[PDB]
Design a protein around this ligand. Sequence first.
Ligand SMILES: COc1ccc(N(CC2CC2)S(=O)(=O)[C@@H]2C[C@@H]3O[C@H]2C(c2ccc(O)cc2)=C3c2ccc(O)cc2)cc1
Lengths: 237, 220
Amino acid sequence: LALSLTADQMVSALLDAEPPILYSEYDPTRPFSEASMMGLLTNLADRELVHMINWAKRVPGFVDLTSHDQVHLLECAWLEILMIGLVWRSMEHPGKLLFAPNLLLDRNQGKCVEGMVEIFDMLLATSSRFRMMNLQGEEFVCLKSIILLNSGVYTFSTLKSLEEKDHIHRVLDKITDTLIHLMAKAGLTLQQQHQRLAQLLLILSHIRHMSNKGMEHLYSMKNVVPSYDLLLEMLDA
Amino acid sequence: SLALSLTADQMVSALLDAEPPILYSESMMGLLTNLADRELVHMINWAKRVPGFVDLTSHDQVHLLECAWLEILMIGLVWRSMEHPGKLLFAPNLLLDRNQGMVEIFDMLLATSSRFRMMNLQGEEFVCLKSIILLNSGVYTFKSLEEKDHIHRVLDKITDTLIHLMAKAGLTLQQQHQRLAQLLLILSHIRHMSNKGMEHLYSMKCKNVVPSYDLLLEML
Ligand SMILES: COc1ccc(N(CC2CC2)S(=O)(=O)[C@@H]2C[C@@H]3O[C@H]2C(c2ccc(O)cc2)=C3c2ccc(O)cc2)cc1
């Protein structure tokens, strides 16, 4: 059904699929230690993951994939999705990261965990870049769906496999069409439309980078990462 | 900036003419390190000819190269291996396949090579993509505000260059932006491959081959 959506139907589907805003655990002891703060973020992240599978099942075209390739895309994308959501929540709070409405952290609180100030600096800079470009909500939900479909597609010798990759790349093309259509409705010229598209997609490489760093530093300290069976369990419900 | 007055055809001509030669190979990590060592010297001199790159302070040029150096090598590899399905053409005399492989990276590099082949990636588009990698990889990690604004204009020029090439080649508008999106989403997998390779380099204890900031400033 996904490839039959017009642009505006794609936007509506994605908007209505949006996950809820969750709160951090209430009145934790502050200030934080390294362990306690990581406990809070791990607890929030784990609760956001249930809602991210609900959201992914509603991304047009996702369900058409085999459960195996659904899990694979979520394994590859889950941190990038958590991170772009964090950056979007944080746009209107310059200098700060809004992990939850009750958990707004300034730069110097990232120092609690050993090398998580560097990722904080990267998330803040991305939020400024979104604020500069005046990223629109309809653009964000498109970008977040691109992350889900694109991040894992390149590491899927059966003929079945080529069919899903083509189906991926067809949905991605449709979300590209959708992004362009929103820009044209906004009133951007063709040249501005092309430049803004590239410039939203180029930011995705940095979000990949941040995600890879996040994992990397995490390890240099592991089991907290969600397992295949866990993602696959949650999917089957 | 004369970079910002360039037409699409001047931009391609500048990048095509700055293309480094394909070098030859002459322990498998030793061979690759020797090759990469020689590849680097050409990449600095190539980066200096990317339009709008020398208008950056030497501090910012180094930061971009430090961020982008392994993505640039990797995309070169993928481009050389594109007509050798199943194999990676590290050099005309060092063509390897999966068995010789670091199997994780190899399969990611091969999948990237197959994607470029599936899309019929053109050499004019190739050079455009490497320039983007160089200018985009470290711009978010950065006087500072004039610098970033300059880099985003040059990036807009390369976008215009890519779109112009497609328009010539006969693609419709819808095919043009779809084309542009597919090329740019591949860059995000190249960044991922660079990160994997980078942590792997350190995992195998060879964290000395990563050119440092000072080394790049010196070569520059
Ligand atoms: C035996 O163990 C291994 C562990 C890893 C690998 N890797 C990829 C495996 C092949 C699929 S890799 O990602 O670490 C790294 C990127 C690419 O392959 C390596 C390499 C390089 C870079 C600088 C060095 O000083 C030395 C090696 C690469 C490279 C060099 C030149 C070039 O033009 C293009 C790419 C290989 C062997």
